[PDB]
């Protein structure tokens, strides 16, 4: 019986390729094939993934060349990647994440060919800089479940940390299959890279901004301060003259000069400070 705790480890490279491929077939369910190994009864690890030749019609897709797959795979071995197939993935734009209809059928034959298969679904159009939407599933048994048997065993809290969404319940996730938790496990060297990925050259740090143009910006903001001071005086004068929330509620059109006054500070400051400091340093370090 399958343990509740078993993870899927995906290896950071695979994720980037899944996205850059999904966000291209913009309105179509592009698909691909996924390579890894079964470390253990509590694990599956995916290490790489690659696309295929395929065509579709908006309502469907499928791949057309079967030879290309075996040839590519057998080629890769000559350069240290002997790993084999463990699953497949396809992108759902904007729908959400679930398996539906045909996707179960092409899935289920994998499980007749290789138990412990995994189907992954990603959504590239809801995702945003903070977070990506990924899910990984496997089919519930082909019933004989009137027995009321649980699909899985549990001996940990480790699998009940997350709340299933309404959408997958609509399409029936716990009724026909089950979700499996995604986990990341970066190694040392790639994470050393990943922080360099934004560093910018020393050449720039010591450079001064032009002093002209800079003065122009200073005069621009200082002359912008006036109107805000003038408005601020009235805004101070008139408050508490009416009920408290009816201050804000009547201030949805016209701006409130406090914030616009305040946020022109942090522009005279910061700018003037850093420019004067940088000049003050480099006047010594060169001759």
């Amino acid at each position: 019986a399958v343990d509740t705790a078993e993870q899927v480890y995906i290896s950071s490279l695979a994720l980037l390729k899944m996205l850059k491929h999904g966000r291209a077939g913009v309105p179509m369910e592009v698909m691909g094939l996924m390579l890894g190994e079964f470390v253990d009864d509590y694990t599956v690890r995916v290490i790489d993934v690659f696309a295929m030749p395929q065509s579709g019609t908006g309502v469907s897709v499928e791949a057309v060349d079967p030879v290309f797959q075996a040839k590519m795979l057998d080629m890769l071995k000559q350069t240290g990647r002997p790993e084999m197939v463990v699953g497949w993935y396809h992108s759902h734009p904007g729908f959400g994440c679930w398996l539906s209809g045909v996707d179960i059928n092409t899935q289920q034959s994998f499980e007749a060919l290789s138990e412990r298969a995994v189907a992954v679904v990603v959504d590239p159009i809801q995702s945003v800089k903070g977070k990506v939407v990924i899910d990984a599933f496997r089919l519930i048994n082909a019933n004989m479940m009137v027995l009321g048997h649980e699909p899985r065993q549990t001996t940990s809290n480790l699998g009940h940390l997350n709340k299933p969404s309404i959408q997958a319940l609509i399409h029936g996730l716990n009724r026909h299959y089950y979700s499996i938790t995604i986990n990341y496990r970066k190694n040392e060297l790639e994470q050393k890279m990943l922080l360099n990925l934004h560093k910018k050259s020393w050449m720039e740090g010591l450079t001064l901004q032009d002093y002209s143009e800079h003065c122009k910006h200073n005069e621009s903001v200082v002359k912008e301060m006036l109107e805000l001071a003038k408005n601020y005086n009235k805004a101070v004068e008139e408050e508490d003259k009416m009920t408290p929330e009816q201050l804000a509620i009547k201030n949805v059109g016209k701006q409130d000069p406090k914030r616009h006054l305040e946020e022109h500070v942090d522009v005279l400051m910061t700018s003037n400070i850093v420019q004067c400091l940088a000049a003050m340093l480099d006047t010594v370090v060169f001759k």
Binding site: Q7, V39, D40, Y42, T43, E188, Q191
Partner: protein, 87 residues
């Protein structure tokens, strides 16, 4: 238990630091701390190792160690860091 032992801590942190199964680490992350017990300042070297580690489960087991190293002492020097991690 509690008998600090120069050799065994290496013979197990070396294994934990270089194996791929997770459950093994979730066992050892406790298995280490019991080699310290009330040893107050003595264990501090081991501490500064584990809390620097990249690997999340070793970074955790650092905390269990600094708990079992200072039972009941109320020593402020343990609190000041053991709480800073939470934040």
């Amino acid at each position: 238990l509690g008998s600090k032992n120069a050799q065994a801590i290496e013979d197990m942190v070396g294994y934990a630091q270089e194996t791929q199964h997770e459950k093994i680490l979730r066992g050892l992350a406790v298995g280490i701390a019991l080699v310290m017990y009330g040893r107050m300042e003595e264990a501090d070297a081991l501490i500064e190792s584990l809390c620097r580690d990249k690997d999340p489960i070793l970074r955790r087991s650092g905390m269990y160690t600094v708990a079992m190293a200072y039972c009941g002492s109320g020593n402020n020097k343990a609190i000041r860091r053991l709480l800073h991690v939470a934040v």
